[PDB]
Amino acid sequence: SIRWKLVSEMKAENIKSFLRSFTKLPHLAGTEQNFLLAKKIQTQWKKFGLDSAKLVHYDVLLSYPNETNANYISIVDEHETEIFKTSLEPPPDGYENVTNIVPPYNAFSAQGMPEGDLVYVNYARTEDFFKLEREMGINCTGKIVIARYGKIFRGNKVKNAMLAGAIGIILYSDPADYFAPEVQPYPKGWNLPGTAAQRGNVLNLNGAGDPLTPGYPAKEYTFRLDVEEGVGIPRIPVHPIGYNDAEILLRYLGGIAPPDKSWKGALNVSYSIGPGFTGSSFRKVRMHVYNINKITRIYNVVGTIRGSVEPDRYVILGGHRDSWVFGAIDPTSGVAVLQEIARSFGKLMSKGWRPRRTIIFASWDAEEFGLLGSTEWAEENVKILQERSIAYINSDSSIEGNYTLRVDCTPLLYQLVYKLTKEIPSPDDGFESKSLYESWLEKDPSPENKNLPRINKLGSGSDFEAYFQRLGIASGRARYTKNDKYSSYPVYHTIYETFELVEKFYDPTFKKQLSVAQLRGALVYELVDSKIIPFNIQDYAEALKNYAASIYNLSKKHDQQLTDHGVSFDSLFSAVKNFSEAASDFHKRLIQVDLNNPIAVRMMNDQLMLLERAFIDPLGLPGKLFYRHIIFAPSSHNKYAGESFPGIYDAIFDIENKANSRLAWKEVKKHISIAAFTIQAAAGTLKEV
Amino acid sequence: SIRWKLVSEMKAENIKSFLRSFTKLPHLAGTEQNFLLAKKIQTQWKKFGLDSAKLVHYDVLLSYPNETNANYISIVDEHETEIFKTSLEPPPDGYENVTNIVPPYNAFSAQGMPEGDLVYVNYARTEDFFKLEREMGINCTGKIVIARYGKIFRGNKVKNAMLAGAIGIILYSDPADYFAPEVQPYPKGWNLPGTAAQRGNVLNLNGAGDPLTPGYPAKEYTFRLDVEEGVGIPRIPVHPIGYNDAEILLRYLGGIAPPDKSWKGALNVSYSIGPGFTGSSFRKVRMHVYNINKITRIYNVVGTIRGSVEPDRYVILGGHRDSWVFGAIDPTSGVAVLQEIARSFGKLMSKGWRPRRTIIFASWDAEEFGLLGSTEWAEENVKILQERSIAYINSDSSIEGNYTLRVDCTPLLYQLVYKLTKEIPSPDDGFESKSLYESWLEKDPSPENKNLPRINKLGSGSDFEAYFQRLGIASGRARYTKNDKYSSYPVYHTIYETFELVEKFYDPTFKKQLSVAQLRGALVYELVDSKIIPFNIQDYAEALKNYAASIYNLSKKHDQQLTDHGVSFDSLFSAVKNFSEAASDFHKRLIQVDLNNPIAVRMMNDQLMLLERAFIDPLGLPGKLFYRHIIFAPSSHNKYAGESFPGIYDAIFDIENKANSRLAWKEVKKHISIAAFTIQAAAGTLKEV
Ligand SMILES: *[C@@H]1O[C@H](CO)[C@@H](O[C@@H]2O[C@H](CO)[C@@H](O)[C@H](O)[C@H]2NC(C)=O)[C@H](O)[C@H]1NC(C)=O
Ligand SMILES: *[C@@H]1O[C@H](CO)[C@@H](O[C@@H]2O[C@H](CO)[C@@H](O)[C@H](O)[C@H]2NC(C)=O)[C@H](O)[C@H]1NC(C)=O
Ligand SMILES: *[C@@H]1O[C@H](CO)[C@@H](O)[C@H](O)[C@H]1NC(C)=O
Ligand SMILES: *[C@@H]1O[C@H](CO)[C@@H](O)[C@H](O)[C@H]1NC(C)=O
Ligand SMILES: *[C@@H]1O[C@H](CO)[C@@H](O)[C@H](O)[C@H]1NC(C)=O
Ligand SMILES: *[C@@H]1O[C@H](CO)[C@@H](O)[C@H](O)[C@H]1NC(C)=O
Ligand SMILES: *[C@@H]1O[C@H](CO)[C@@H](O)[C@H](O)[C@H]1NC(C)=O
Ligand SMILES: *[C@@H]1O[C@H](CO)[C@@H](O)[C@H](O)[C@H]1NC(C)=O
Ligand SMILES: N[C@@H](Cn1oc(=O)[nH]c1=O)C(=O)O
Ligand SMILES: N[C@@H](Cn1oc(=O)[nH]c1=O)C(=O)O
Ligand SMILES: [Ca+2]
């Protein structure tokens, strides 16, 4: 009943009004406007009747362009004359009086003015650089590389380019990846204009949080690394340009033809690889990048509704509010959703309801600079969060497309997600009498089971990362997305993410955003109020069987080497079998618990709460102290994607090219052994005696 | 009432019979006799009525002499003729038919036959090597060094000798340190004969457990490091000799006179330092050490009495049973105590009692080889132990001397220790109508408070180490000790630790051993059965104030450098003040808890249980992944001693001699900041909201 009142109280029109109110001005992390927005959210939470709503600050390293030394890329001739220089642009229609839009840049780029020959490196993925070096005869050492955005997180591209020896990397938005067919560019449609460039940071933090204070919250007194030693800071310049400018740089590239169609984007240029130019005054490319890194105060808003029975157990509903410009999709659509969820919980409170456990609401700052606000607060509060948290539900963008739902969560949460989506009306045209679960199932069926909707593994990409990958708190993300060959959505991280874009092109009725609010809010409600925490551990058992089969299958091409080096997956399969038995027995006992015996209920709830924690190894993964989950990690090739059995996967990846096979296969054996132990230990936490 | 029945049921005569029964034969780890002893303990626990008693095994690296390539030290002349060779000895009187006594050796010594000039290095402490190099003009590089046992753990001596460049280290027992005045050598008295040598391992494990499997339990499937990479294995030979042989080696040392009386032991030799000989055929010293390292199965016995109310909360009573020879003091006096405690808990069970929480009884194997059995079981069971354990009470030697009690424990346990000692009769002559607390107070008053008995900080030395220093489980150790300039007790780790030694010289009535059994058992009982866990966190607050003053005082000699490098202790003192306030508030709330509300009681018990855990940093201390407690660690100079604020202490130690002062002071700032954060976080765990 109460769940229905929570869901039914939420209104599309309220989400619309919140979104309009938060998207009139830019709200970049570390700027006065994003502090004002924090205070507005805080005022609203107090009005809604939350028990607390406080600003919690940190002083973390941020990065901004230098207003008096603007960044650019140029082409010079052999006489050092600048022949072309990249450029810039007015605010979107209606925003003419907005004066502090940050120009395009890649936060945390190194400073410098490298000059050299240009080489096109496709998406700058690991496989693209392998191809260049191993198949194409191209040496990127000492070159400036140009890569198209898309497919993977941009910091991975920069890491890859550094490894390949490039001295600078230019990123651009190819219309193949950011221009949907038969749609007009903004403002007439929702596509990316050729003058616009995508902002975004290019760190490789691997879960560290503020670069200067890995492991510990960035308080006033806190020891800071020297900036030159900041974690994840790239060592070459990086800058983004739009496709009009990229076309000019790519047009006269010479050398080898593109190797196959998968390397050719959509511009009217050959997509030859370089190095060097042909057919032109075009002689060398230069970058000039002089962004400033500076310690800057950021502010989270953290509020609570204290539990009436288990105040020392938490469900976290957290979403970022900092944007690159107006951020009407990212994150402000999620900011509006979070406010409407908080308002609805306040309405329940007004009629005398209080949750069983405690809800923590959080509006995070500086997500765009490396998940900084959410990570520093996890670092501050780790001791209470790791011993008391039930789950983390994110509230970043709600409306990245208008096709269907996309959910990423731990297997613990699959059952609850499917249950709740069955009870929320579908917002989709043609599904007027059906549930969200029904439309989602039709539009995105699971590859492993055709009669369930797809749910993806957690890697990174938003503020749940430290909660799940470092602390082992069950996490979930849900939002509307596209069906569509473009990456993200066309105007992602540009000036064109405006309220008008969302209202006109994405979700005019706000019904799709409403459905996402209802699901996020209902997840928090069931996790915080149910007497027995609504996880299912047998779904985790089945997931482990799938992951074990997958990593074993990846090893088959090396079967002879497994034999010769005495590598076996037997202990991993044995642990998975033992875990399946323990999970079955646990659920058999759980249905017998005496619901009227509070300590009996609390003991089994502690087993449900602590199961995800069992997968966290304090030693971390190789080279990555802050990714500690043995079953999942963000991919080392693309932090946006989750990878299963990451220690094993990274040990076996490209193993045939390792210099020392005996050493390489011993590392595979190491990670197989760690994974077998960790699963067996997790199974041990479920045992009755 | 029940506590009194537990204590009063224990009998001195039963401890005596157990001790006699377990000390007839050697019971070295990894040998058949110590497996037989495990099975005997298991049979007894089942007879006593424990709910379970199982053998839990691991396969870990152990080290033994080679029966067909005996170790020795020799002196050769310039013609390579052996002039002297160290030797060996019959079993003690009454043990003539015992055939498998392991000869003296230092387990895990490197193999080799180094030859060189000899140098005497006193106790081979850090300060002894500083003196040699910085004051005395002695260069130990390329020398064989001879050090007397005592003052510090022998593995620290070996680490120090390796750092100083020695190519081998001979250890010996000087009568200054192992021969008590006016006492006869065994068998006529309890002193060390000149033919006897002290066994013991010489690893530098820093909490790792089995050298081949740091971090993970050594199961059948487990990945193992290559033996050459085993953690803590020294790289030079080490071998122990008795004082008759050491006298021969020291007699003709030449070079500089001993620098002061603190370098001169008690033998009739000059204690000149070397290098080299004078006044003799004595030309060079050789070692010949060829012990075998081999993976060997070890067995813990692990038993339980399941709790009736909180079966998912644990109090661990653990003690080792492996010895070097008969081990009548170490550990077998503790083995006999543990059996008598288990028997008494069984007697309570026979009359219908069951504890509130679960007792775990453990008889550990291979403590003498590096705390191996207890550490591998902590590594196996870490996920349940870290989330559920209340405390660990050790049960190693009970009777290291006959003067008074020595207790080492976390501040959480001070109040309970004082309470229980007031209710146990003193076994001491002259104290027939007084409590153990009263005799202990008279004989060993605390330096920080003259009206309380001394309680020491926890470092290492026995099986509590991983539980406290890695996992943050409140731990305590209690035993009888000496008053007395000798180190340990004279026959420590020799063939002469016999039942006859204990009965004739240490505790003929067994009353002192009985008092230790009563205290260990009463500690387990109160921790496992009290509705509210009996810790006091204000005592921890007071301890932190003392430790903060101590480390700040140590910094005063560097006051100018603190100023010049911007180093301040302000945040540490601020955290300590905040912790004191939080601990006061917590106890003010604790007295108000509704004892009839099980969830209210469980929430506050979880805060008491999880407070010690808050001090554990998963990143570890510098260079030491497995010492994680920020308030205490085993000293880096002597693992037997506890050091407070170890990260700060090691950063400031000898700082005036660091090559780079800017870098060195930044590391001091780092560790001050980590300590301030950790204390503030621990304070946060106590907060109500
Ligand atoms: C899964 O549980 C089984 C049964 O407890 C474990 O099987 C034991 O495996 C060891 C070898 O590692 C054998 O010595 C025992 O005989 C096995 N007992 C059986 C089959 O009853 C197995 O090790 C567990 N898996 C893991 C990864 O711990
Ligand atoms: C101890 O608690 C006090 C009070 O909450 C903290 O004091 C704040 O300290 C910061 C500087 O670090 C100031 O900006 C605030 O004005 C202080 N507030 C006060 C004095 O009311 C103090 O930081 C805490 N200590 C630690 C180590 O976290
Ligand atoms: C911005 O660039 C100008 C011109 O190079 C320079 O003088 C100034 O120091 C820069 N600002 C910062 C904070 O580095
Ligand atoms: C890459 O090119 C650079 C040119 O300086 C050279 O140092 C390096 O060895 C080359 N590597 C390959 C694989 O060609
Ligand atoms: C939104 O949905 C409408 C109706 O299906 C469709 O025409 C449009 O392309 C979708 N918009 C976006 C931005 O994907
Ligand atoms: C013991 O030493 C003998 C003589 O050197 C040798 O032949 C044998 O291999 C050694 N045993 C082991 C296990 O190394
Ligand atoms: C120690 O003596 C060795 C002799 O080989 C030498 O290498 C080293 O530099 C000397 N150090 C000091 C402090 O005398
Ligand atoms: C044991 O106590 C007696 C009586 O005080 C004393 O003479 C003897 O030295 C003590 N024994 C040991 C081994 O310290
Ligand atoms: N969501 C942002 C921030 N970004 O996401 C991560 O996972 N790390 C990181 O900095 C982006 O994609 O730029
Ligand atoms: N207690 C034993 C074992 N030893 O104690 C440690 O603390 N480490 C270690 O190996 C000894 O002192 O030889
Ligand atoms: Ca930090």
Ligand SMILES: [Ca+2]
């Ligand atoms: Ca191990």
Ligand SMILES: [Cl-]
């Ligand atoms: Cl989200």
Ligand SMILES: [Cl-]
């Ligand atoms: Cl002990």
Ligand SMILES: [Zn+2]
């Ligand atoms: Zn976002």
Ligand SMILES: [Zn+2]
């Ligand atoms: Zn973003």
Ligand SMILES: [Zn+2]
């Ligand atoms: Zn011992």
Ligand SMILES: [Zn+2]
């Ligand atoms: Zn010992």
